[PDB]
């Protein structure tokens, strides 16, 4: 299960170089 980690990922993902304030942010791939 990744419900907790997914919620934390989407809460801090925009704090990443890729995000130039025009990001929905990449899909969560770290389940597992």
């Amino acid at each position: 299960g990744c419900r907790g980690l997914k919620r934390l990922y989407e809460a801090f993902c925009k704090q990443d170089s890729d995000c130039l304030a025009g990001c929905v942010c990449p899909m969560f791939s770290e389940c597992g």
Partner: protein, 612 residues
């Protein structure tokens, strides 16, 4: 005694021996899907954790035995949790439901402490020897707040901070530590939130934190590690174990983390349900959700009158009071699908229709005493609505599949069918035993009707046939002499006397899909499925229409419960011995019992019994 570090990661909980060589061994648990928040009970050698994927809080001994799920209902994102080892209380913060709750460590006497003006609490720390608890709030303007451990005198300790995690108390040195997940540093302050200092500022992604002796321990998601440093200067850094990504929480297990004394440690403060620390090292008695503290400030009274509301897979209880106390979800196992609800105020038993298994069930509000009143063998039945004759001890229910009104005793024995017709489509139903009548919607093809009949199916009459599209819900008040219905197509709620006179439209605007109605005191409550709302109107006309609760999904029924006056109840002629009637006791005319029979039986010569 030896000091151990416990960390959660994915679906495992692992223990690292600090005083020996670093030796990684997993806690032999089973059935964990995502272990997040950790604590322990030094007395019982018991570990406690929340599971965000199962929305549960569980506990077990360090050896895996006595696996117990102590909270399993009404959690969304329980990412904060702490053990009150003096009072033997379990505390938790739910970031999803915006609630800080408490119960006994075994789960009993669940209560909500903080719910108003609360936005996403996450990290929780307890100081039961002082009476204070501390927590971090994420949503909105992030802050670190403090309250008494009964929830009272809430205050904001640190208002200028980013989202924080790892709230940890250094009890020996009277200092608070946390990681800031937005400014990416580790800082500390005294217990008033003052004398702030940044402990370590060069860390890429500091997430978890704990404290022990002269050290702090943190985990960094970018460094993928558990590390230790000087708790005051941040230097003297070492790596405890690396190559660990997404460590959800870390915690030091040692007797020195759980010390001190308060008045709850002895005989639970002589509190009947909950002993709750408050400043300064004192306590107050607490009660389960919706209970009242008695005059002695020691015992608790269950709520006498309340509102029950149902969704697809939950049934909830709310009360009206001066605390604006939150609704709670009743911990009813064996509840899968609810479509309709009713309550027996004599035996305090809640009844519901389960449309997945096509049954009528009953249970206590604590989940126990589960029983199946109506069931189909594995032709086919399909209960649609139900209404309880509390005096005759009968359930009147509608079956969509067979289009009959059937009657069953609360022990499951069939009484019989009182309505069957070729054209009949009885759906909604409410019984008025005080006057010998039942009221039901007849969703006949092209002609939806509101009808009344005697409780034995005779004296059938159509009350209303015009102005109806989908009359989908009924309620009545025998005291005021009114009948109520909601039409889910015409998007309105109407009322009329039980005789079918004085029909008026009470509310016809700002409604999308009214699916249920109930009467509570002088108010009429209803539920709007599409708008996800509970609303009410003052039937005296004094106060305007009022919103009660919003954003409630999958609403199905609403049902008010009044404290049943036993002296008045025993005066109903069918209450004692069913008036001597074998099957149907109905009040007629000059308040006397007349016996009647279902449609498959005929009254016998004794005029008390039913035969073929």
């Amino acid at each position: 005694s030896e000091a151990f570090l416990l960390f959660s990661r994915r679906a495992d909980i692992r223990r690292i021996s600090l005083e020996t060589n670093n030796n990684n061994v997993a806690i032999p648990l089973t059935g964990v899907k995502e272990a997040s928040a950790l604590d322990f009970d030094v007395t019982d050698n018991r570990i406690y954790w929340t599971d965000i994927s199962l929305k549960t809080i569980s506990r077990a001994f360090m050896n895996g035995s006595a696996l117990e799920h102590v909270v399993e209902f009404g959690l969304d994102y329980p990412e904060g949790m702490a053990v009150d080892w003096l009072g033997k209380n379990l505390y938790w913060a739910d970031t999803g439901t915006n609630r800080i709750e408490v119960s006994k460590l075994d789960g009993q006497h669940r209560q909500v402490l903080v719910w108003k003006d609360l936005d996403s609490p996450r990290a929780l720390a307890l100081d039961p020897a002082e009476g204070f608890m501390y927590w971090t709030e994420w949503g909105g303007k992030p802050k670190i707040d403090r309250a008494a451990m009964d929830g009272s005198e809430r205050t904001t300790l640190v208002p200028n901070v980013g989202r924080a995690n790892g709230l940890t108390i250094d009890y020996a040195k009277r200092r608070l530590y946390w990681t800031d997940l937005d400014t990416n540093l580790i800082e500390s302050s005294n217990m008033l939130g003052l004398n702030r200092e940044v402990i370590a500022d060069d860390l890429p992604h500091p997430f978890g934190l704990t404290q022990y002796q002269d050290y702090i321990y943190w985990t960094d998601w970018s460094r993928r590690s558990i590390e230790r440093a000087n708790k005051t200067s941040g230097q003297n850094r070492t790596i405890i174990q690396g190559h660990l990504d997404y460590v959800m929480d870390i915690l030091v297990f040692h007797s020195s983390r759980q010390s001190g004394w308060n008045e709850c440690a002895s005989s639970n403060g002589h509190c009947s349900h909950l002993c709750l620390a408050v400043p300064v090292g004192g306590f107050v008695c607490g009660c389960p959700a919706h209970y009242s503290l008695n005059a002695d400030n020691r015992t608790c009274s269950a709520p006498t009158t309340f509102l029950l509301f149902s969704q697809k897979s939950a049934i909830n209880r709310m009360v009206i009071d001066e605390q604006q106390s939150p609704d709670i979800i009743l911990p009813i196992h064996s509840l899968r699908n609810v479509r309709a609800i009713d309550y027996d105020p004599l035996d305090k038993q809640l009844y519901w229709i389960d449309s997945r298994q096509n049954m009528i069930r009953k249970a206590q509000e604590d989940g126990s005493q589960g029983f199946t009143v109506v069931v189909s063998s594995v032709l086919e039945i399909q209960p649609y609505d139900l209404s309880i004759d509390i005096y005759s001890r009968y359930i009147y229910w509608t079956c969509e599949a067979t289009n009959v009104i059937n009657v069953t005793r609360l022990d499951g024995r069939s009484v019989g069918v009182v309505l069957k017709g070729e054209q009949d489509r009885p759906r909604a139903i409410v019984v008025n035993p005080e006057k010998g009548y039942m009221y039901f919607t007849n969703l006949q093809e092209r002609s939806p009707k509101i009808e009344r009949a005697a409780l034995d199916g005779t004296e059938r009459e159509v009350l209303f046939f015009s102005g109806l599209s989908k009359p989908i819900a009924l309620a009545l008040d025998s005291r005021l002499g009114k009948l109520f219905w909601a039409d889910s197509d015409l998007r309105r709620i109407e009322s009329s006397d039980l005789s079918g006179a004085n029909r008026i439209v009470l509310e016809d605007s700002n409604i999308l899909q009214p699916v249920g109605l109930t009467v509570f005191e002088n108010w009429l409550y209803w539920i709007d499925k599409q708008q996800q709302m509970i609303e009410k109107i003052d039937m005296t006309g004094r106060e305007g229409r009022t919103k009660v609760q919003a954003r409630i999904a999958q609403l199905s029924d609403i049902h008010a419960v009044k404290e049943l006056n036993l002296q008045e109840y025993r005066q109903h002629p069918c209450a004692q011995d069913n008036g001597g009637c074998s099957h149907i006791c109905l009040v007629k005319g000059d308040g006397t019992t007349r016996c009647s029979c279902p449609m498959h039986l005929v009254l016998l010569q004794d005029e008390l019994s039913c035969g073929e």
